[PDB]
From a paper:
We hypothesized that mutant forms with a combination of the substitutions in SBP (Met199Gly) and T3 tunnel (His165Ala) or T2 tunnel (Arg240His) would possess increased activity. The catalytic activity of double-mutant form Met199Gly/Arg240His towards the substrates ABTS and 2.6-DMP was found to increase by 5- and 16-fold, respectively. Double-mutant Met199Gly/Arg240His exhibited the same catalytic efficiency of ABTS oxidation as Met199Gly, but activity toward 2.6-DMP increased more than 16-fold, compared to SgfSLwt. Indeed, the activity of Met199Gly/Arg240His variant toward 2.6-DMP increased more than 3-fold compared to Met199Gly. Apparently, in case of double mutant Met199Gly/Arg240His, an increase in the electron flux from the substrate (Met199Gly) was supplemented by a relevant increase of proton transfer to TNC (Arg240His). The high activity of the Met199Gly/Arg240His variant can be explained by the combined effect of the SBP geometry optimization (Met199Gly) and increased proton flux via the tunnel leading to Cu2 ion (Arg240His). The pHopt of 2.6-DMP oxidation of double mutant forms His165Ala/Arg240His and Met199Gly/Arg240His is approximately the same of SgfSLwt. There were no significant differences in sensitivity to sodium azide between SgfSLwt and mutants Met199Ala, Met199Gly, Tyr230Ala, and Met199Gly/Arg240His. The Met199Gly/Arg240His is a prospective 2D laccase variant with the highest activity under alkaline conditions.
Numbering used by the authors:
A (entry chain A), C (entry chain B): 40 to 317
B (entry chain C): 41 to 315
The structure:
């Protein structure tokens, strides 16, 4: 229960790229704790982030980010010699800005939104191998006053997997009726997808909720997405529909049949989920 | 005509039936199933009880997008909310108006262009049921929405329009000046792009800009994937006049192989120049 | 540069459809100077354009435009005999209109937007051959008061090529830090794509810029698009990021690996590009 403050802090974090089991690779904030997706990075508009990056891996790796402000030296491409050699370290810097009126009279959009970072050098100079291996994660940049959620869950459609998981293994997320639940939805790889949530719905705009009665944004429960698309939203769990095992899945039929499905488990306050019997 | 405030409790019967050629369809009366299924129209606030009967020999279900439904009306075998052969079940859809929540945020209303479809035939995601034709449109209107003269539903289902054989339309007729509503739904395996000659719409809830402050892009071509639904109203012939106005998927092999139809816009005298 | 005036002029131009080398086909405003993409057409809402069209080729050809007001005789399809026979001429007329209140109290959208024209009869009755061969070009319709760019660049994803160019050959576009640069981005053919620009971002609305602090449009740097989609935007070159070779590419991973890539070369005021060697 709260809102994002105004930003402008200089922030620091250590990040590592590490091999994981089965040919996978992940980003982590502590050694041996790499995850797919990588760790959620949250900033308020105006914040600067210095990522003190370490490549623990035996092959080059990079960190490229969407939406945020970065100089070429933090592009994270071989083009710009801003990759990281094996065993090497590098500080990537991401800046963000508030919205404001330009001198030419136009309005400059702020950095706020649902973004993501990923590798750009593993396998190919566009990171095809590193992204396939799991080198991706979410970045939320919040505008002053944006509503904060009770929990945030990241769902990545990477080719024919969710979060590089084996088919038919979710992931599942739990909430209680009334929780404000934030979804970060990212796509990667070769395929288009359509993200669908049973029992819930959001506005197709920056925050996923209408700004008020004048917001003409479409309200949807199904959204087409392709490689490197990112969007997000906040829903009220069970709003107008109640507790239950609410499925979410890609709606491309073969993709849902092959396992691109998971559960949003919404509990009443007493913890019950009517009719859930897996 | 403009939509009123909703709030009524409404009722329909619906049946799932086998149709010719391994197809299956929904209908509001027995032996009268259609593909797409019947158009369901509600005002925000309405409740709909669908007294549903599975007349076929395989399980079927009814799952809806966008509307408010309890988990018992999800329409999946996972919840045992499917309908066994010969069975019946009442699925209930509710709808709500927009309004501010107690937490201070704005809750969107139910209004928009939605759809219902099977979730259990062939697979536990309805792949065979959707392929066979078990889909239909639902429109929920907001108080004050302008009402159209006609509503036409165009479903891109895999490589087909409305499960029709290639190059068989469908076509739709209007008169210049008619306010025509299009419901545009996609199902199956493929992405598509919907395109209309001679006409354009806003990429927002209603397909019409709300006024001069609406920044929505105006378009005549829209990418869509399985279970996407959108809709819009056009003034037939507005700024362009009468004629056989093509619509089609703009994916080139799809338009070449048959996902094309005609919006046949008539002069007042009933004729179409150039057709 | 400034702002678009109110429209309402009646304009005329010659257009030719011509064969080019390698089995290609292009539109041009001067005989012998066709190009792929075709010439940029720019109109202010309310303007009329009479295109005096000549088919110099040995196959029937047409001119079909998106978004604009055209009568059935300027549809440019075989079904109403508005194609152009080999050697023939025809006047295609495009009209446009301002937004306005209808007498019924509803709001009529204006013609403004990022549009395109292309063939509709070469090879198939949907122009599959003509489009593949290069018969496509951009149309911009501006609203009174739209900000004018310093330059406009057109990027067409046509099947697996950019602008029918051999793979890995760009195109590249040059700008100086602070330039107001306009991108028109058109897709054609068989495939879906995702368009991504490093170092830059835009608003997913008509103009690509937020109208002000009440515009809830998502700000993005990645956008899914399919055959005959058109969108555009304006960016301030290097805004918040500095000079550099800023890659743009399809983000479908194999497409970026197969050469659907180019460079937005943003130069320092001294004309140099840091970290880039030509
Ligand atoms: Cu890139
Ligand atoms: Cu998918
Ligand atoms: Cu659903
Ligand atoms: Cu990327
Ligand atoms: Cu489902
Ligand atoms: Cu298609
Ligand atoms: Cu067209
Ligand atoms: Cu569905
Ligand atoms: Cu066409
Ligand atoms: Cu591509
Ligand atoms: Cu077209």
């Amino acid at each position: 229960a709260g809102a994002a403050p105004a930003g402008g802090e200089v922030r620091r974090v250590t990040m590592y790229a590490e091999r994981l089991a089965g040919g996978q690779m992940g980003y982590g904030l502590e050694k041996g704790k790499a995850s797919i997706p990588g760790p959620l990075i949250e900033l308020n508009e105006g914040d600067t982030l210095h990522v003190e990056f370490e490549n623990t891996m035996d092959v080059p790796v990079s960190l490229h980010v969407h939406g945020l402000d970065y100089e070429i030296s933090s592009d994270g491409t071989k083009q710009n010699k801003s990759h990281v050699e094996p065993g090497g370290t590098r500080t990537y810097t991401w800046r963000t800005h508030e919205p404001g009126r330009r001198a030419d009279g136009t309005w400059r959009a702020g950095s706020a939104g649902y973004w993501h970072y990923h590798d750009h050098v593993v396998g190919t100079e566009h990171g095809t191998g590193g992204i396939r291996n799991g080198l991706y994660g979410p970045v939320i940049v919040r505008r002053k006053g944006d509503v904060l959620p009770d929990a945030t869950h990241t769902i990545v459609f990477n080719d024919g997997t969710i979060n590089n998981r084996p088919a038919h293994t979710g992931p599942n997320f739990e909430a209680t009726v009334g929780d404000r639940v934030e979804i970060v939805m990212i796509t990667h790889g070769e395929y288009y997808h359509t993200f669908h949530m049973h029992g819930h719905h959001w506005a197709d705009n920056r925050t996923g909720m209408l700004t008020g009665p004048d917001d003409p944004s479409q309200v949807i429960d199904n959204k087409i997405c392709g490689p490197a698309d990112s969007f997000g939203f906040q829903i009220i769990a069970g709003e107008g529909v109640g507790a239950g095992a609410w499925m979410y899945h890609c709606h491309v039929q073969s993709h849902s049949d092959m396992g691109m499905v998971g559960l949003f488990l919404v509990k009443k306050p007493d913890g019950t989920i009517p009719g859930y019997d897996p």
